[model samples]
Target chain A: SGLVKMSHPSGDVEACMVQVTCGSMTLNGLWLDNTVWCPRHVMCPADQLSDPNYDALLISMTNHSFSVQKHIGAPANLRVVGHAMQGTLLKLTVDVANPSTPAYTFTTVKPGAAFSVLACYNGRPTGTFTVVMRPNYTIKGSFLCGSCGSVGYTKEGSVINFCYMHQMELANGTHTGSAFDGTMYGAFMDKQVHQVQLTDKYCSVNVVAWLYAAILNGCAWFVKPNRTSVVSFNEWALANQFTEFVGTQSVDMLAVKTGVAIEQLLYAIQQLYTGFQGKQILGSTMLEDEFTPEDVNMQIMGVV
Target chain B: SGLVKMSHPSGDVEACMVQVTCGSMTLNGLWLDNTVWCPRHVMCPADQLSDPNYDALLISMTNHSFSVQKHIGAPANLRVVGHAMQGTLLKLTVDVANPSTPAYTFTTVKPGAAFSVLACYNGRPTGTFTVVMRPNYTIKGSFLCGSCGSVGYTKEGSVINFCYMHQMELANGTHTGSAFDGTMYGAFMDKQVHQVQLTDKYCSVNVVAWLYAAILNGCAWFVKPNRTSVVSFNEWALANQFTEFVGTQSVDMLAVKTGVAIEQLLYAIQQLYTGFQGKQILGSTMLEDEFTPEDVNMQIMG
Candidate 1:
């Protein structure tokens, strides 16, 4: 039931990961380009909008209960009648461009979290996806792609899962287990070695990794206390320090840590990433690790 | 009381906009760097974070209704107890970096819109400010600085007011109502002309103007459909079209129209803007209007 198909350059398309749950019960093993292939449906990890039946994949399958929520014909494939088809183990909302109001009301965000259709709200692979939307009206369907940015999440596990799928994509192919990118990316994302390339390095896995790492460190520090003074971490500083996710996959092992809401931490990472775009850092430093504060003398880590 | 203060090339800081609501009861006349000067408080239009008690200015005076909401020691200056201090005529919320939760849970946003304290969240002059936060948990205190993006608003009036204040700052000083930036930035932002030079054009007003104009044309069409097919406008296309606000203030005249939620429209503008930054367009074309879609044959405006 956890089977997914893959196509090699030789034009050979075959089903693999038959024992793993990439498409059957959860998005726990999905890679960016990896398809959510199953008896239920098929979907692009990065592009869900184009597929007519992909929305069904977004319908969270964690629970069996389903409802008839209201939605526009916007996403063209967003499901209003589903939510519990398969256990995505996660759920989220996309703040798309809604021009009209009708039907009932809705804010249904599903799993496998890679929207090709709602991928570009303002015109990018990132949209306002909520892990916990306080039940507002919903989307023109914006989405967060691999390496683009992160989402405002509700569930902690969903946040990690979202990051995990992206990690698989970012460290896709042989690059997964290979030695590269300095900060132990491959080794950290070791399991992400060759699970069928999901997408590119343009999704939220970077932050997810960073969040994974930061939370691990944060949680460790809280229990035993730190050798250093308690650094009240803010969004900018954390982003500046961990320019890219340098933490290990065992960082995932540290998921139980508390950054309060690690989602807040992830969002903080995104907040800065977007501000960079706003400031055009996306052009210059390309997510520079050297960005200093307005205060000047203060170090990013603030340890010294 | 649309009066404000300004300091030109010289070392002289003079009290101006004395008749303005900038720091008075409203934020109707505020620029980015421009300080909200009044007896109630003196606030820098941009760096509100460093200014203690400046938050007293963010409390809206539009209505006398006041309540004590819960808050933390965050911002060091945000007022949870006082909102009626002044009538900024506009109100908003700044999503800051809050690690801990305490006090009566809150979502208290304020006026002048510029937040120096929350100027950066992940690290920029853009925090998650809400025009209409569906009433949820709050912030580490972020802020949209000059030339930054926008906020998710609740009130149409607040949205426009937000845009106006940013416009006054964006086209600061004599540049207001002038003849430069290709499109009618000044002319469109006419009243914004020399209004004590609020912040730089870094606020939501750009989209406010675009929202202003888009709504006008949209309304015109809605009243009588579009000459070009009834283009069901989406966030991406509209953002691509009006790379900048080309609409007129009378576009304000068109606010009554419907995009369902103009905030949605403005947010769409911010959406694309951030997407640009996200895609690193901030480095390249710098918001190049020339960005095409994934499907090549289709025009961006399509």
Candidate 2:
């Protein structure tokens, strides 16, 4: 047998050689050029005293990059390596500070819609609780009441009346009936007259009443088509436009010609009113009269 | 020269056969297909013997078209015709039922981003407020309190320490650190002890200390290069293993052959310790004893 001695081994051939005496033939273990780049705790570099072997020793890889130094004795409450990034597929770890609750892991991956979390439990596999987070909002309470704004009811069918300190000058507008309909609205609405109580007219009240009378002629006294009355003959006479004597004759003769009793004629008139209620009516008259009267007569007959 | 009407003395062929005695003609207003649509307020079917020229009439091009003796009214609400579609280009009118509040008119031109109020006056021209309109919601809110998960916080920064009923767990074996690092958690995050808590027993607990202990001897405790006192070196004499007498003499002879005083050696050790407090002590005693300490002895110097 030849004399055996311990010598630094390097290169692929030396690596293949079993240095059972030294056991490990490390390459580049000591400080290189007086610089300790590789942390002392990392794997010992293969020995490389010179030339191609030194280069080859570097090429030969080790278990770690030799750059990162290992640490020990982590803090008790927070486990940086174990709890944060333990057993994860994406080998990624993020730091969370000042958590609202300690029990849940509020870890997130990315931002916006991609934000998510991984669930860990009892050192075993569990499920994931992905956090698709949104934004926080202001305190929702009483509406910021102002001079002019909107107040919507929290629940359906809650009606709020329009209350203000102003008068309704005119109602030249349109709106949907359903939007502001249903239920009673007390005295103001009960009047059905959106009245603007004009104040302090110097004229006497009697003078005003006289002026009202002048404005309201016999025509103003003419009643609307009442369901109770069977006097549609007046309406028909206007629409037909016969002479004074003839209009009366025509109505009278209709009962005479039909041979129906007074009660029957009356019933027919009632039925006509019932049928034409809530609908437009058209009427006929001789062409001799002006078109204005005919138009007015047709409108009364409920025609468009 | 033929008899001509007054003022126009020019005679034309066939001086008019018909007499002009205040005549009027009712011509069709809207003409189409050999017929005319009547003007407003007119009667149809010309039995115009009593008044032949009926101004108000509706005539159909189709002979069999039916007639109704009523006048049609124009479409109502003429004010909004010139405006852009109210609901589309503007905001929805709110609290319309309020008799006290004036009508509000909003204008919208785009989705979500742009809108305005044209007018917000009381039902009429006077006593109305005008305001620019925008959506009540620029951004939506999360009904679920992020602080307490579903529980939500009643107030901001309300001390929320209650743990969730849920704890975090992993699958397919825990990945403690970088993938190349071993499965043992200590193998992965040997450095990240401050931020996380590893309760699992199987996880590695700073295995790197073992490697450090093997390299730096038991002094691994003191050599912990913190931010301060980063490095220290203790210098000691290296072993000279040559068994020759000359090599032995080189080290031992120095005891007597040196003319230097013992105070010098004492001062050297003091300097070594005092000069490098936190640094390493690299001792070296390879100076062979070939000289004596007889001060001023010429033979001792040689």
Candidate 3:
């Protein structure tokens, strides 16, 4: 049995925090308070020398192991031993071997996936219990999570959402999401809308949304290699270069992009959003239409 | 003839071993093997590391002189030296003329005393010698010769006797009196005994007359205040004990006091002869006359 219960040699009764390991990889999921919960597997991701609560429900899947222990002594009560999948539902057992001997079994649709333990106990037949489990998807590229800064989630699947947040802000105000990615738009909306509420526009609310849109568009270039829409847009804008006013972007974009000289306008615009503002335009159409080193010089020439 | 040849650092040969002054002790009659000779004193009697030889007839006496030398390194030889009593018999002259030297003078009764080397030279004198001085007197005592056992001698007024030999046996014999006190005696007899030609009764012929007569009568006790006969006898016997012996009492006295006990007869005879023979009997008469611890044992039951 690959089970290890870390305890102080002096036998201290304290709660352990756990982490999951698959092959050579160590995964730490989203932050809940200071702890990194393993969204990719069932484990507590402890910061060194500190731990999470014992009753913290953790689950994992086939051929994977969970590192369960404390920063100091073995966690006392909440014991989670093994998990199995049956018909698309995962049954997790918290085997607490102790004074009042009680065992808990949790059923969920994902094994080796992130889940939370809730409420009280039961036996044989059943009693009502609650658990929280988050299913993750693999996002193929790097991202910028506004205040979370530049984020890379190992290279495989991660529970990191580019726009996930506690509360999201819109034109009217703020609202929350039950679970990020429960809806693609709900997750995005909730992440930014909530951020705007907390920051009171110290960082632009509109810029976040625009960048998210740009990020999605840039990601789309890879998912679809032949999208030439940025070429059409650029050609048309260049031809109609003498337009007295422009309506194709946000004021935030214009403030960032429009140099005093109208001829240097596109250079300034690319600079503002290319970095953290837009995850360096990962799947952006303009990046897809961009050409040689000399072609990039033309924009510089316009700005200079 | 007792002249010792002292040689020089540069090869001058001379007489060296000199005696020093003031007293009448003519030093070197003693001995050593080589080096200069001191003809003034008695025997070598050196505690025996070496011996002194002399064909060198040297002598000295009176208030005359002695030659002294440098503390170390032999004093240059070409010198002879002395001491004496009356007229200056042994004349000493120090012949150091640094660049000039001469011979030394000598006239003495005796020489060939103990002396030393003073100066340079590889061998035999070219070196000077020192004659340290001491005077000696004869003390009469018994001496043992291996087969002879013990012997004693007493003669007349002048000196000791020398016929002293062993095993005196008598039947009939002829012997002669020789002038042992004369210069003839001083010469030959002085060299040893007078070797007189006579009928040889061997050891007995001599002792029966010579010292036995002088010894018996010479010990007439002392010459002082209430001096006992032993005192006079002790003085005279000590003085004449160095002379020869002859016996007259053994037969005469034995005939008078004759006892017929055969064994005791031999006792009388044996006591009469052993140890200078009858000399043991001298001074003994007083010993016999003196009283004993118990009234002299009742006069020996006389």
Instruction: State which candidate has the highest lDDT.
Output: 1
Query: Model 3 in CAPRI terms: which quality?
Result: incorrect
Question: What does the interface RMSD come to for each candidate?
Answer: 25.7, 61.9, 73.7
Report the C-alpha lDDT of model 1 over B226-247, residue by residue, as the tens digit.
2221133333335444322333
Every candidate's chain B TM-score:
0.18, 0.11, 0.18
**Candidate 3: segments with Cα more than 4 A from true spot:** A1-18, A21-26, A31-264, A267-304, B1-302
lDDT of 3 by residue, A127-176 (tens): 01111111122111111111111111100111222222111213221222
Single out the weakest 10-residue window by summed lDDT for candidate 3 chain A: A1-10
Candidate 1's displacement at residue A201, Å, is 13
DockQ, every prediction: 0.01, 0.00, 0.00
Candidate 1 local lDDT, residue B208: 44
lDDT of 2 at B206: 11
lDDT (C-alpha) at residue B267 in model 3: 30
Q: Rate the local accuracy (lDDT) of all candidates.
A: 0.23, 0.17, 0.22
Best-to-worst order by TM-score is 1, 3, 2
Each candidate's TM vs. the true structure? 0.20, 0.11, 0.15
> For model 3, what is the error of residue B101's alpha carbon versus the real structure, in angstroms, after optimal superposition?
99
What digit string (tens of lDDT, one per residue) describes model 2 on residues A41-114?
A: 11222332221232233345332322211111111122122111111000111132312111211122111111
Evaluation by TM-score, superior candidate among 2 and 3? 3
